[PDB]
Amino acid sequence: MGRVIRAQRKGAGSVFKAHVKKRKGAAKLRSLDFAERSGYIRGVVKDIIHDPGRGAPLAVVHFRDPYRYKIRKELFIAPEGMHTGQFVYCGRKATLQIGNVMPLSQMPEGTIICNLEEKTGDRGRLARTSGNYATVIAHNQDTKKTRVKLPSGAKKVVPSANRAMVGIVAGGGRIDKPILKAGRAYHKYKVKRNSWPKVRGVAMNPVEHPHGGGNHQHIGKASTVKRGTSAGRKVGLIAARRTGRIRGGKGDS
RNA sequence: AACGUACCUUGAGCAUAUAUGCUGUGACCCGAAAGAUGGUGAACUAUACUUGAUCAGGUUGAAGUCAGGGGAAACCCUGAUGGAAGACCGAAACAGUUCUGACGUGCAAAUCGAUUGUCAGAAUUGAGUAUAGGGGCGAAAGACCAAUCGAACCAUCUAGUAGCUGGUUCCUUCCGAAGUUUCCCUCAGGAUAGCUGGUGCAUUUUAAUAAAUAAUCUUAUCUGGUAAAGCGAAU
RNA sequence: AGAUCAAGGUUAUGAUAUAAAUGUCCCAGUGGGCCACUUUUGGUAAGCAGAACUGGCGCUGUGGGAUGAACCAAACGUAAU
RNA sequence: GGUAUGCGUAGAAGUGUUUGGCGUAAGCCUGCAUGGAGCUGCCAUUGGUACAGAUCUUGGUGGAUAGUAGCAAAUAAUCGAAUGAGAGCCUUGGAGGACUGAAGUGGAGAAGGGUUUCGUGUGAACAGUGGUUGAUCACGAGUUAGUCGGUCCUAAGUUCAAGGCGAAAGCGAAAAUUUUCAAGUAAAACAUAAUUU
RNA sequence: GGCAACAGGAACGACCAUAAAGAAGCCGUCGAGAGAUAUCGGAAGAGUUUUCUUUUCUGUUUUAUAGCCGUACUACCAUGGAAGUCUUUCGCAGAGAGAUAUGGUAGAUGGGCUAGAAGAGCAUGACAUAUACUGUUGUGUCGAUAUUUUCUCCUCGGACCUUGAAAAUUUAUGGUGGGGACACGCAAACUUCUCAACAGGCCGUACCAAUAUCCGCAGCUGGUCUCCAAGGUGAAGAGUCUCUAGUCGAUAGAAUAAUGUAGGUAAGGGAAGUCGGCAAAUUAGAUCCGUAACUUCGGGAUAAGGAUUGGCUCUGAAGAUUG
RNA sequence: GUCUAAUUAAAACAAAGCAUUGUGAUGGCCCUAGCGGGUGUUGACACAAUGUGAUUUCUGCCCAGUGCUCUGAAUGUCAAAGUGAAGAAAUUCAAGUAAGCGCGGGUCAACGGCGGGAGUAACUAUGACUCUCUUAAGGUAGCCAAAUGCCUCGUCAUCUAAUUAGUGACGCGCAUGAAUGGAUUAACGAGAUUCCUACUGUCCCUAUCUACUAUCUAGCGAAACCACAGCCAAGGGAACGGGCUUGGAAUAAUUAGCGGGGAAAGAAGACCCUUUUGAGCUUGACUCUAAUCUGGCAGUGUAAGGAGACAUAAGAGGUGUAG
RNA sequence: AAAUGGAACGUGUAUCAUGAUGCAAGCUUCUUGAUCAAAGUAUCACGAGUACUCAGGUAUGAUCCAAUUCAAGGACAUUGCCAGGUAGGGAGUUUGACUGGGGCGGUACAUCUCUCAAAUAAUAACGGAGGUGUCCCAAGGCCAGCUCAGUGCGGACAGAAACCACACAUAGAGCAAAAGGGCAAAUGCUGACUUGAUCUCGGUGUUCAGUACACACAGGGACAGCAAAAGCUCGGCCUAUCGAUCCUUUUGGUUUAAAGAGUUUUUAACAAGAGGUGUCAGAAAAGUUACCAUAGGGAUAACUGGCUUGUGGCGGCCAAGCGUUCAUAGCGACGUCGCUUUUUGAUCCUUCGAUGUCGGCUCUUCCUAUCAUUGUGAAGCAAAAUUCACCAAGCGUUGGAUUGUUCACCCAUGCAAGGGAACGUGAGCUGGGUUUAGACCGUCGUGAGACAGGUUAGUUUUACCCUACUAAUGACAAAACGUUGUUGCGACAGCAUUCCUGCGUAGUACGAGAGGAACCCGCAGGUACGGACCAAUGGCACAAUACUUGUUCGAGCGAACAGUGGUAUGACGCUACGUCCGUUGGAUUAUGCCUG
């Protein structure tokens, strides 16, 4: 027979969750209440708290409720320059200053942002990670449209009433310091996921991979897998338009 | 009137008892690698997680800092002070290399004794909890999953099948072979005729108180190109 | 060619018949063989293979070449000569 | 099932046998010696019917040896007194030699053991040698809590209300949808108020 | 009450509200302390004696919970206005966002005397009592010196794409209301004060805790979680050796054959031996130099290549308190 | 640093690094019998899937074959439903006709590839060259008898008293080579491959001594194994006896040793052919298979515009001799 | 699921000549506090108690108006079936056989001839030579005429050249194809004319079980075709030129069945063929396992023995010649014929319910086809040197560089280095290769994966049994006799010493000389083993004793303990590296001579 290939085991938890005991409380953007649609609000940052499992720094902040009596604590992603004791603002009437949070219809093109929301209400699921920057380069007053450039480079269209946090987001650049040994990039995957310190194909014994095994060690069967074969055959490099060296430019239009 | 018939041409079957086979299930006997449906265990071990815990003393001096000294500036220059790194030699912790040394019906279903490696981290680990049999897990050997691992482990459908091996039990009397042709995904087996044995049954002036046969020579009659020849015939 | 009368020696080569004559069970087995003489391919060849015609060995003891399944005598109820 | 007015505690079945005999042979008949309650012959039938064998199953038992193999790692035991039927021990207590060396062969804790801990008494197996003491038996006792601790809290995670699907069992399941699926709160009419997923 | 930091015997929570604690990983650290020990001296009694030794020994203790003194030690308060910069550690840390100072505040974990302390009890020995659950006498006195052969509070810094759990229970504060609340007093106070009665259920407890109680079919050199942890030499928790505790438990008295089992030396030459320099030998500690090529300029570095190293008798140096 | 736990610890693995590849959430990778889960307390400096391998230094040419996607211009294929025509009807064809494969490009840090022939230089030898053949393009920069050169004990110096080796260099290289990665590489190894330095019973060649055994004695006391079984030659045989025919021969019971013989015993051949035997495994092998892609109906709504005057209210055309 | 959307005032802007029109609009941003729990207002309760203690309500504060909780997607996802494609991810499978073992070749798997075949027939192997899966409307059917292979003489252009003529033409040709056979007014050339290459019924021939297919053959009946007739014709002149069910499918009577009865279409059936099974009596069918697990096999190999010897080591013979001459000193070509078993294949006879299979080490042994030593003889043998050849197994046949080796090839000793045996030998080792499990490389296969090609890494096991053998002791009995001495004899079996060296012999003999008798012998010595002893010397240690570290013994003796502390000397022994030793009789091969 054979096995589930090392692709296919990843959905059974017990050596494949994320080790999230020390992660720090489900960071999202603020919700749409009445006030951020109508006016604005003032909140205050009290400490900057680290997120083992990120690279990024968080942002701990609280607010006084327009409806209840208590304080209500939330967790942003860190805009750049965020000193503690900064006075944040969240509103359509809230004027642009880093790092406030304001909807797209009240800032022009040319600004950069972070923590972009696509669907107005779902509080910020776009382009927040370390060392990138949510951008908008297009306004359109016909049916309230604003095109944006994600850090992919592929520029796509979002609605305009959604919210985002103005400015670049803290953390970059943690690709340009080589981790340099097999003890730090143990701990780089101590608490992010549990991948392997990953093990190649061509010396898996060829019943428990596609590729490996043979008299030499060689991929042997060719290495461009289909559109949709039989999850999980797809170990390789899935549906590759190009392959190989790029002797040139690759940015999109 | 031609030809096929398992046909009638004055009927013979059934009812069981017996014996030998051929055939179908346990099919003479025990025997296999495996296929299945269900439950099963992480109490070594792969392995993350949780929470605990421990791992002696020693050499090498990293940035940072410290004045002395030179020079136009940039600042170069010994002296220290400082204790960082997956850094080194080493001990209980662990590992298991070469001796292919000590017992190889042990001390043992893997250990003892000399030797060797790491030893402040990819470290070492007690408990809790996940992961499941064609899958778990694997710093990848098809290792490991309870002395089992190229698929466990435990009861069944399971007396599962075998052209393949082992055994196939009392005495005398009578008779006494095969190893061949064909056919077959056969060439180690089966059917098939062959030989044999049994069962009587019909009958000879060749069977019952020859002028009729069937087998070896003769007599007669056809039948073949092998020796022996034959090149002063063919080929 | 057929039926039916007429004539017809002693039946027509030798030597026998331990008896001849047939229908079932398709009856249990067995479908691997071996050797010598001549006759004989394959090979230089062999205790090899490959055969036609017999006899034997397997089935078989036996007296004889000490010995030896086949060689040569003879094919094995119990007994004396 | 029929049968022989069948033998049988005045010895029936098998067991031995240097008593005697019949068959070609398998097998009986017979004498003696155990033995203690049931047995065979003719003729009809018949069942799981006679064994040298199956690397046969089970239970005794050989030679080698029934005394060979070997009980050789951890420095190494010793005279005298007891007592004892009897002592190289262990069983003591008297000396006094050397080990274990405080990352012990030392004192107490965990898992697992389950009566071993203790006195008293002892015969045989038990202690790969003995045995007067033993982790063996015999026979007795022996574990006390408000403070040590389980108990409460919650961790990774068991998926463990009925929204759901499956023929049902049940689900290698971040069950976040499930009138109120609120704990409620000394409370006020007129779902006690903003509150609790 | 205090200029304050905060102080005091107690003096307004019923809810709502923040804010902490409850809440730590791991590394090296100067400060103190605990006990473990070690030398010095009084004591008390034991050790040995040919010979000598004012000598080698045991033993001197005081628990929790309390009250009072109550500094190590960082951070605060008042003052004050520092450059000729200054203060401070093993470090770098510090300063007109107030440094040195002058005094104070609070944490004392720490100690030290007194409560605990019947010569408490205990212990070291005295004497006397057939002796017995007896009797009674005496002692408990001081300094010092060091250590991670260990724990502790405190202090700062260190690696780090490694940032180091939750929650039961809990304090104080904030808070609108509301309830106390007369001055000739009677008081009262879930009062967070003093103090008296009153119960606190459930079960687990003996022992081994591994060369004889576990699992290894067994009393089997085998794998088993941690805890205490001494004299000497010395780098040291090494390794050799004894005190302290405990063991002789591995079948025995005998006997000098091979071969084997392990620990060895062997005159010459020294790899020829054998698959091969593999078992095995030299080297090994520390100080003093002396260091080659190749380097990514961090090495190679203990390179190699050397010298030196007892015992005994001495001078020279490195400190603290009172100057 | 990691693994074969019980014969493989290394040249396999593991990195760090480097170029790629899908995904902007209706998502990609994926468990799923089905409902909902993992990735994800998340979001291109994150996730998923890879080939390699520090770095120092360069990534040689090729899109034919298959793998591969395509903003892909496509009559040549092409399934049901649905729509047409015949037919009394089951049925017969028609018009159709989407995705695939073919068809058109893009790509090798995707698998993998990367030739011979003659001639030719005032000696010879050569081949700077010249011609021709043919391919998707012709092994490029470097290396080498490499761990990879049949011929092999290559050809040449050196190490050596004398070296099939180890170093060097030489290239027609059976079958060297650029991330299936090429060529140099400084620091460490239970890594292999050789010559010195030290060296020693490794040996020339054995010499001896201590530790417990055997051995011998007192207790204790088994196991595999065994046709009965043991004196060899020659001959026969089933062909290298222990008995068989002739010989040689042959005097008990037994200890200490040793392994030449018992074709000694292990384990029902691990190699090997064989079963009309089965398990692993692979795609250019037979048939299917979950996932996936795709067309229709189903569930499934209300209006608009246009593309279809279809059925349909309603209008209008006629010239051959003659008349 | 908090403020959904319009409308109204609420201020400002612009235009309209104070309005309408549209808009901004209604409110917290300069600064780590913080706000909840109704005040205000209004009118009622407008009170109760009784000015007096104390009373609520609504709405405003805090705008109306309509409901869907909010966006975003919409008749598309999702989901139900069916519609085809991709789909080794995953499941079940098979992957023949024949064969001097297997592959890998091979068709010799059905099928045809010539032999192989021993004169009936029959018949063998992967024996020999081949052949076939076609081809032909004429190459068929049959009457008619007319005879070719060649070769002679010929004939403008005319040879190997054409075409006509004439003779000889026994078939030397033709006949579709291989090979045989037949074949002469045919079975050929040419010509005529036609479809018998037809329908039909059953038997018969060779394949053999006297089956089936197939192919031939003779009929009976028909319908014809040529020829005047008789006749000839049911395909190639005869030995090849080919197939069974299931169906698909025609052609068919103008045929029955559809089970209640019609009619009509469909299928269904019978009968002749064809589509098809070349592995030819008929499965639809690719790989490999160095991870592989089983039934077994000597019916079948690798290893060990065994007969055989193409191979090779191995001699004989006759002499063509060489050897200055001289064939035969030594040689011996061309050809002639013979033994061994070291290999090298052969073969498959034994062991597959296991014979531990390659080297070196240690170690006994035997063997002649003799290297050199003893005794000769030969020569182109002067001598020295060396060659030949007979007899001869007695001691001897080595120390090293690479390799894993036998050989190979070195270096050196040697006055000098020969071959061979039970594959001698793994319960004696070693494990370096080789022939498991790790792992890389080059190519070949698309790959898991092979590679008589290279790397490196890997458990090598039990004896106490019985003979065999070294050493150990020994009994009743037996016997020309006892229990027990001591002292003897040898039948008997083993048998071990060895070869060099120098000096003489002497520069002698000899030789022209050069060179040179290491001649006979005597003397001295030396190698290896062999047997022993220890005085001296080397080793090892009376672990007795002296210097000595660490710790306890209070201090002073010790060697107290560190499983032998380390060191140095060290007597008894035991030992080699040292020592002392190892020999004489009698037959008689090879041979010379003796006499005859």
Swiss-Prot record:
Xref: SUPFAM superfamilies: Nucleic acid-binding proteins, Translation proteins SH3-like domain
Subcellular localization, as worded in the UniProt entry: Cytoplasm
Disulfide bonds: none
One Pfam family per UniProt: Ribosomal_L2_C
Region listing for Disordered, in residue ranges: 208-230
GO terms of biological process kind: cytoplasmic translation
Tissues in which the protein is found: In larvae tissues examined: gut, brain imaginal disk, salivary glands, fat body, muscles, epidermis and trachaea.
Superkingdom as given in the UniProt entry: Eukaryota
Gene3D superfamilies: 2.30.30.30, Nucleic acid-binding proteins, Ribosomal protein L2, domain 3
Keyword set, alphabetical order: Cytoplasm, Ribonucleoprotein, Ribosomal protein, RNA-binding, rRNA-binding
GO function term, MF aspect, one: structural constituent of ribosome
GO cellular component terms, semicolon-separated: cytoplasm; cytosolic large ribosomal subunit; cytosolic ribosome; nucleolus
UniProt record similarity statement: Belongs to the universal ribosomal protein uL2 family.
The name this protein goes by in its record: Large ribosomal subunit protein uL2
Lineage: Eukaryota, Metazoa, Ecdysozoa, Arthropoda, Hexapoda
